[PDB]
Amino acid sequence: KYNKEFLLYLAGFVDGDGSIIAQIKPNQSYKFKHQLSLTFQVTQKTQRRWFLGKLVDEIGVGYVRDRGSVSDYILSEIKPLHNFLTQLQPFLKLKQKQANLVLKIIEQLPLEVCTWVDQIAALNDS
Amino acid sequence: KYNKEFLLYLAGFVDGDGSIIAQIKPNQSYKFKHQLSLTFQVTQKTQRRWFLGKLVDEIGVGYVRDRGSVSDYILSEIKPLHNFLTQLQPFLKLKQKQANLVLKIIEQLPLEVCTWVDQIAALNDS
């Protein structure tokens, strides 16, 4: 996937309403554990999910999630997440700080590892 | 003022967090009256108004407004409002419905006049 023309746009809308959220989920058990998730998302009022359906078609990869009065586009996990984020990034501005921070995690994962997430404190506590 | 390169971006961020608000203010007295205002705006947490200061410098024309925990870029009135909106518009998507609707009002004003505003019901009541 190659874009660049509208990649300029989506950086805008993202910097507007666009979450490059990343988090650590429990694994190997349940409480203080070890297995993460990196997620790009956009959530518009269910009033207009067609744009959210447009995001999916423009971006190709992804899905819309119906959550009541709001729905949301969720790319999901590393696979298509690296082709997208990598391409977006250069049209940075606001939220493209973590565009990189996420792109960082999406790499070399065989301890400075699973540490970037908290650093991704875009007002996320603990 | 001519842009087009980032005009693609600002359409994004606008479609994200960007108000092309328009309204009728009272005049010639006080209650049911006749004198309007067309306003482009962007309001980010005072956390990061530098972007709001960037909007002003990129867009040139405008001012940031400190309102407590939030601040906002307010272009203001027709003058620079027509060069901007007109240029933005073609990079439409979400909010560029009213980009036009506003551009409409910003014209021929000597009765279908001052009627577009309510039509600019982006969840604005009465």
PDB file of C-alpha atoms in Angstrom, chain A residues 5-6 8-17 44-45 47-48 50-51 54 58 91-97 123, chain B residues 5-6 8-17 44-45 47-48 50-51 54 58 91-97 123:
ATOM      1  CA  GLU A   5      -1.751  12.334  -1.640  1.00  0.00           C
ATOM      2  CA  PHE A   6      -4.402  11.848   1.080  1.00  0.00           C
ATOM      3  CA  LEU A   8      -1.486  14.357   4.118  1.00  0.00           C
ATOM      4  CA  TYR A   9      -5.192  14.514   4.931  1.00  0.00           C
ATOM      5  CA  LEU A  10      -5.495  11.599   7.290  1.00  0.00           C
ATOM      6  CA  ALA A  11      -2.572  13.082   9.294  1.00  0.00           C
ATOM      7  CA  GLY A  12      -4.811  16.085   9.779  1.00  0.00           C
ATOM      8  CA  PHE A  13      -7.958  14.239  10.791  1.00  0.00           C
ATOM      9  CA  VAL A  14      -5.807  12.016  12.944  1.00  0.00           C
ATOM     10  CA  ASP A  15      -4.112  14.911  14.666  1.00  0.00           C
ATOM     11  CA  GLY A  16      -7.737  15.999  15.105  1.00  0.00           C
ATOM     12  CA  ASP A  17      -9.661  12.862  16.107  1.00  0.00           C
ATOM     13  CA  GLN A  44     -17.056   9.299  15.157  1.00  0.00           C
ATOM     14  CA  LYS A  45     -20.646   9.589  16.348  1.00  0.00           C
ATOM     15  CA  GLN A  47     -24.508   9.619  13.353  1.00  0.00           C
ATOM     16  CA  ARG A  48     -21.832   9.459  10.662  1.00  0.00           C
ATOM     17  CA  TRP A  50     -19.888   6.357   6.723  1.00  0.00           C
ATOM     18  CA  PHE A  51     -16.718   8.387   7.103  1.00  0.00           C
ATOM     19  CA  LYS A  54     -14.608   5.568   4.216  1.00  0.00           C
ATOM     20  CA  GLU A  58      -9.416   4.522   1.837  1.00  0.00           C
ATOM     21  CA  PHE A  91       2.886  14.398   8.027  1.00  0.00           C
ATOM     22  CA  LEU A  92       3.272  14.609  11.789  1.00  0.00           C
ATOM     23  CA  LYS A  93       2.320  17.821  13.701  1.00  0.00           C
ATOM     24  CA  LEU A  94       0.309  17.026  16.840  1.00  0.00           C
ATOM     25  CA  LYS A  95      -0.103  13.268  17.553  1.00  0.00           C
ATOM     26  CA  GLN A  96       2.758  12.101  15.375  1.00  0.00           C
ATOM     27  CA  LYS A  97       5.083  12.087  18.397  1.00  0.00           C
ATOM     28  CA  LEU A 123      -2.973  11.493  29.709  1.00  0.00           C
TER      29      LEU A 123
ATOM     30  CA  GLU B   5       0.228  21.767   0.039  1.00  0.00           C
ATOM     31  CA  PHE B   6      -0.854  21.897   3.710  1.00  0.00           C
ATOM     32  CA  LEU B   8      -4.809  19.289   2.451  1.00  0.00           C
ATOM     33  CA  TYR B   9      -3.682  18.887   6.055  1.00  0.00           C
ATOM     34  CA  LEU B  10      -5.723  21.579   7.711  1.00  0.00           C
ATOM     35  CA  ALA B  11      -8.833  20.078   6.027  1.00  0.00           C
ATOM     36  CA  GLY B  12      -8.006  16.940   7.960  1.00  0.00           C
ATOM     37  CA  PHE B  13      -7.424  18.542  11.341  1.00  0.00           C
ATOM     38  CA  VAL B  14     -10.462  20.681  10.707  1.00  0.00           C
ATOM     39  CA  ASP B  15     -12.653  17.738   9.835  1.00  0.00           C
ATOM     40  CA  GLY B  16     -11.196  16.444  13.109  1.00  0.00           C
ATOM     41  CA  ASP B  17     -11.271  19.391  15.529  1.00  0.00           C
ATOM     42  CA  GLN B  44      -6.974  22.659  21.786  1.00  0.00           C
ATOM     43  CA  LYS B  45      -6.226  22.099  25.462  1.00  0.00           C
ATOM     44  CA  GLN B  47      -1.720  22.130  27.354  1.00  0.00           C
ATOM     45  CA  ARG B  48      -0.708  22.641  23.729  1.00  0.00           C
ATOM     46  CA  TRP B  50       1.607  26.148  20.373  1.00  0.00           C
ATOM     47  CA  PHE B  51      -0.187  24.249  17.637  1.00  0.00           C
ATOM     48  CA  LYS B  54       1.146  27.396  14.628  1.00  0.00           C
ATOM     49  CA  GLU B  58       0.605  28.884   9.042  1.00  0.00           C
ATOM     50  CA  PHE B  91     -10.357  19.136   0.557  1.00  0.00           C
ATOM     51  CA  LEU B  92     -13.806  18.634   2.041  1.00  0.00           C
ATOM     52  CA  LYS B  93     -14.842  15.232   3.535  1.00  0.00           C
ATOM     53  CA  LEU B  94     -16.618  15.667   6.880  1.00  0.00           C
ATOM     54  CA  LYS B  95     -17.215  19.329   7.897  1.00  0.00           C
ATOM     55  CA  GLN B  96     -16.789  20.809   4.444  1.00  0.00           C
ATOM     56  CA  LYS B  97     -20.561  20.685   3.900  1.00  0.00           C
ATOM     57  CA  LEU B 123     -26.450  19.952  16.470  1.00  0.00           C
TER      58      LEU B 123
END
